[model samples]
Target: SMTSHSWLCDGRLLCLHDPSNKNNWKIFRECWKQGQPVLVSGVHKKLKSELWKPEAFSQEFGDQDVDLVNCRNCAIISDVKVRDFWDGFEIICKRLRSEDGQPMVLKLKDWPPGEDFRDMMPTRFEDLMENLPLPEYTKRDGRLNLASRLPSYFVRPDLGPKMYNAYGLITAEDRRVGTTNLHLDVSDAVNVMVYVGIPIGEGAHDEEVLKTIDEGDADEVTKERIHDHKEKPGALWHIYAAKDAEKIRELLRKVGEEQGQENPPDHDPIHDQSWYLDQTLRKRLYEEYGVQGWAIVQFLGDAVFIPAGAPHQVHNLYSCIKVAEDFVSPEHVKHCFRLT
Candidate 1:
């Protein structure tokens, strides 16, 4: 049920309310010192309450087996009660949460792979990766998580220690991992998300939820015809700035040579490609050169800061678990060392 867009900065998704003030990092340091793309929400309520319960990651990895995928890390995790073993797929789930008092999630579409070795991952997500407050504009980088560490000219050798301990973890657990495509991030850091679950539905707005197709306030011609339609059903996320990353790398090389695929893993998350964006290429990425916002978030478990060379994507109605950390901020280190 699409309809969720926000640009004109003031509304796309920019609000840090009050981030433990050190002068609240100057509205996230002038939106990454002007490369822009900072959608924050009160630093995950300042974390560490053993990570506000997603049933403690389902009492610790809910019956394990872990990784599963359908689309291709681009995002599309489903479980409409397992649709007759998935035939001709058509469930669409416009309904956020409500599988009878919902509370156990894990819809992950890839990312239970290798090399992030924090003692080999999953000690119940190591306290959401050792409690992330992560804002190092000054100190905090002792060769990162060093076990004799060395090999990070900006790390990405199939993600060792998750990019030299930049730390990462995300879960939508078991419904085969849904929605997280729309890429961009080969580093030039600044990303933080910590939801930790319990989102029941109706667009779960923990804050502003206004660009409507129908849900509450609207009448700017029904907000210009539902402005992409999706004012609720469970928090949404999306962003693209840093001057629209070269028109999204020329629409990902014209959708990778019109889908013939000669080479289109542009942001290279090790290209398996299929992070799910379809809606006619998400309306041709909003009629070419668009998306400055759409983060109808409300993960009161808080902490969402995403900056650096900004271009992002995530869509979750429920079934959540988040953990992320990416630094490099001495005032964006001249824009994160020119993106590695």
Candidate 2:
């Protein structure tokens, strides 16, 4: 994914979509804004919420929001769960709640600045060398899920997202609507904004018939890039506290088991991703929460892999909390990871 920007600011992934189709993915950039959403008059329905009501929200927004200068951390964000079957897959919403868990919410129309989207992108493709390098380019090793050692990959849902479907399976029938009252970070906060992403528009997708990406034609390899591993320690998947991970995994399994209570879906709601998130599980998170500092790991979909705490990267996965500083690990969790 290649993007262009002025040397003045950093860039980030706004929203994801099939270059050939606009109807596929929702506005991922909106989901990342900091203030409440400010939809235009007709946008009310597109948002599908009471927040758009005159009594609830005021101003009407327009194209000006996308200008980078107007957008903030929490703007008109929108998203859906990623599933195996793209169509049969469902679209889930997060509880409009905040960090401390009162209501997953925002003002309706408030835009802050400073999060120059470009900063989230890379200066050049190789900046992503570690995240999406050639198979032969790895340190000669790395595996799946845990292969990245992204702590939040396991810990975030504990406080990562606010999905309705995954939440239903975990919580009872009484609490499924609105956002989870629990105050999970929802976004990847502890992570270091490590890498920059090239917006995957026309040229971004090197697979196009244009330049020889990674020195390959349509029948050969697709794209290529470089990174600064020679400058910094390459991204390392830190197996935090193994026992802590086991303890948490056990808890999620217990929650994921009670599926089909929240949504009236035909098949098991979470059977696809094999994941879950909601009020009950959120409660478990707030109850058990245990990361001393913060862990940073960006999800580059199936194509890339990132080390915890790499800076300059911005992901478009659903919406999430922003990153703060480098995380300080807890020896307890580290001790657990040292286990067999």
Top lDDT hit? 1
Q: What is the lDDT of residue 207 in candidate 1?
A: 36
Worst 10 residues of 1 by lDDT: 161-170
- Regions of candidate 2 where Cα sits further than 4 Å from its true position: 1-127, 130-241, 260-273, 278-280, 288-340
Model 2 lDDT, residue 94, Cα: 22
Number of colliding residue pairs in each model: 26, 51
* TM-score of each candidate structure, all chains considered together: 0.28, 0.21
What lDDT tens digits, residue by residue, belong to model 1 across residues 128-212? 4444433334113422222123244443223322311000112323222324655665444333444433233322433333422
- lDDT agreement of model 1 with the native: 0.41
Write candidate 2's Cα lDDT for 1-340 as tens digits: 5331111001222222122222311342232232111111111112223321221211322222321110113234432222211111112232333355532222112122233322322231122223221222121132211223445423321211111111111112312322111112211222222221222212223222122111111111111112222111111111122223334444555554575334432343222323323234435644776511111122222112122321111212222222221111221122213234
